[PDB]
Amino acid sequence: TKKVLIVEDNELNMKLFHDLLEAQGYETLQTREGLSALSIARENKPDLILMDIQLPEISGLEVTKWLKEDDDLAHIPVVAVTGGCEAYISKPISVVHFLETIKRLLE
Numbered sequence: 064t065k066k067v068l069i070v071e072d073n074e075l076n077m078k079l080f081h082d083l084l085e086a087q088g089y090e091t092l093q094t095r096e097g098l099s100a101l102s103i104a105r106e107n108k109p110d111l112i113l114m115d116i117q118l119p120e121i122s123g124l125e126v127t128k129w130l131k132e133d134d135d136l137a138h139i140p141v142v143a144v145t146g147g148c149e150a151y152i153s154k155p156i157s158v159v160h161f162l163e164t165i166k167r168l169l170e
């Protein structure tokens with residue numbers, strides 16, 4: 064099963080991403096904090112990371128740099144939600160566009 068780690072501080076955005084990804088048969092991991100994202104990534108080895116750039120406590124871009132600096136996490140594709148990111152998506156989120164981008168990198 065594909066695993067997508069969702070790093071999003073907003074509950075509404077978090078649920079949507081979660082709901083859409085799960086409906087596609089993907090497993091998901093969730094955290095509102097960039098630092099926890101690093102921990103979870105090493106512990107669960109997700110296949111893709113959906114990174115909110117505008118986190119309140121820290122720059123998602125700085126978390127992405129830490130990811131790319133870790134030999135064990137650098138290979139994991141990172142999709143930015145608005146540098147080391149393989150793709151980006153803007154809000155209002157387009158469901159099809161969102162899902163296509165992720166599948167494109169995962170499948």
Ligand SMILES: [Mn+2]
Nearest residue numbers: 071072073115
């Ligand atoms: Mn957010």
Ligand SMILES: [Mn+2]
Nearest residue numbers: 081085090091
């Ligand atoms: Mn779930």
